[PDB]
Amino acid sequence: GLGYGSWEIDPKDLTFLKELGTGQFGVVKYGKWRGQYDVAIKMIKEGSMSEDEFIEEAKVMMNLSHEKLVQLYGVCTKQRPIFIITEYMANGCLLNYLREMRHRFQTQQLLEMCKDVCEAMEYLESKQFLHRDLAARNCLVNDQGVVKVSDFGLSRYVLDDEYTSSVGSKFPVRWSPPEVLMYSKFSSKSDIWAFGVLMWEIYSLGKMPYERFTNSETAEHIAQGLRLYRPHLASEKVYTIMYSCWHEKADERPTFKILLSNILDVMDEE
Ligand SMILES: CN1CCN([C@@H]2CCCN(c3cnc(C(N)=O)c(Nc4ccc(C5CCNCC5)cc4)n3)C2)C1=O
Ligand SMILES: [Cl-]
Ligand SMILES: [Pd+2]
């Protein structure tokens, strides 16, 4: 079934309806399951994913459930390429949504986007599950404007060395704390650092962080103490939240439970 029953999905029950573009593992399509339920169909480019490892991990991911996580419905592994079937998010990735200036967002909407992501991350934190590549490009927006976190943990199965190497052209340098870039020290606190950068992306309406610097320059400067400036749309209180994520000491960074409380406190002032 689709979130029920077997999680090997019969591709005969899928109908392809629209190209959605491409992501980390290649082509993504919009389709229907048994003619009625909307799904996203990720077809996994051969050679791009450590597939046996992912399929084992997918059993763990099937047991995660939260309103603000994109739901994994199942897999189609009896053909080439394999497919991954997930919840359909009709407004696409958050980065491109933020960049569409027609939306004319209120800051109350931007803060709600932060809350949505923070709830998803607090849940993963409570399950001791790291995201490992949190960023606006890995969040999706549904037809009601709700933001959900996608592809949690999947960087562990990416085979492209340019994304795996911390000096590769595709590694998320601009979302990484100094202890990741210098020592490969991943923890819940490296997700915290990335979440702060994500809040900055939201309040900057999708600007690239540290745009005036190359990846190498960014890595050097943030380790010395350079920090992203306050976006014009972020109040001082909102900036303090995102800024707290970038402490040079990992153990001085908040948890996602603390961040959520801080975000709700600002929201409750409305
Ligand atoms: C605007 N781009 C271009 C490419 N890309 C993404 C990047 C990440 C992987 N890929 C996914 C994954 N999963 C889903 C899901 N679970 O829905 C999904 N959905 C989706 C994607 C794009 C749209 C566009 C948005 C603007 N109006 C026309 C339609 C709509 C739904 N795309 C494609 C992306 O967002
Ligand atoms: Cl700005
Ligand atoms: Pd062949």
Q: Which residue has the tokens 């949690």?
A: 152
Residues in the 5 Å CB sphere of ion ligand 2: 204, 231-232
* 39 shares its domain with 112: no
CATH number of the domain residue 162 falls in = 1.10.510.10
Task: Choose the final residue of a domain: 43, 70, 87.
Answer: 87
Fill in the amino acid letter for 214.
T
Domain annotation covers residue 2: no
Quote the ligand 2 centre to 133 CA distance (angstroms): 23
* 236 shares its domain with 130: yes
For residue 37, list its beta bridge partners: 33
* 83 shares its domain with 110: no
Q: Which residue has the tokens 């999680």?
A: 7
Residue 193, Cα to own-chain centre: how many angstroms? Answer: 13
Look up 133 and say whether it is catalytic: yes
* 82 shares its domain with 139: no
* 196 shares its domain with 68: no
How far apart are alpha carbons 77 and 72 in whole angstroms? 15
* 36 shares its domain with 121: no
Domain annotation covers residue 4: no
The total number of structural domains that make up the chain: 2
Tell me the residue range of the domain where 231 lies.
92-269
87 lines ligand 1 (CB under 6 A): yes
* 81 shares its domain with 97: no
Quote the ligand 1 centre to 224 CA distance (angstroms): 36
- Choosing from 10, 38, 133, 268, the catalytic residue is 133
Domain annotation covers residue 5: no
CATH number of the domain residue 43 falls in = 3.30.200.20
Range 222-229 contact pairs with CB under 8 angstroms and sequence separation of 24 or more: 222/177, 222/178, 222/181, 222/246, 223/178, 223/181, 223/182, 228/197, 228/200
Domain annotation covers residue 1: no
**CB environment 169-179: b (16+ within 10 A), e (fewer):** eebbbbbbbbb
* 190 shares its domain with 177: yes
Task: Choose the final residue of a domain: 61, 87, 113.
Answer: 87
21 lines ligand 1 (CB under 6 A): yes
Domain annotation covers residue 184: yes
Quote the ligand 2 centre to 233 CA distance (angstroms): 7
Domain annotation covers residue 3: no
Whether the Cβ atoms of residue 225 and residue 248 lie closer than 8 Å to each other: yes
- Which atom in ligand 1 lies closest to the alpha carbon of residue 90? 31
* 130 shares its domain with 243: yes
Three-state SS annotation for the chain: CCCCCCCECCHHHEEEEEEEEEECCEEEEEEEECCCEEEEEEECCCCCECHHHHHHHHHHHHCCCCCCECCEEEEECCCCCCEEEEECCCCCEHHHHHHCHHHCCCHHHHHHHHHHHHHHHHHHHHCCCCCCCCCHHHEEECCCCCEEECCCCHHHHECCHHHHCCCCCCCCHHHCCHHHHHHCCCCHHHHHHHHHHHHHHHHCCCCCCCCCCCHHHHHHHHHHCCCCCCCCCCCHHHHHHHHHCCCCCHHHCCCHHHHHHHHHHHHHCC
* 83 shares its domain with 175: no
* 76 shares its domain with 111: no
For a ligand 1 pocket test, name from 2, 20, 138 the mutation site with the most ligand atoms within 8 angstroms of its C-beta: 20
Ligand 1, atom 21, residue with closest C-alpha: 92
The reported resolution of this PDB entry, expressed in Å, is 1.6
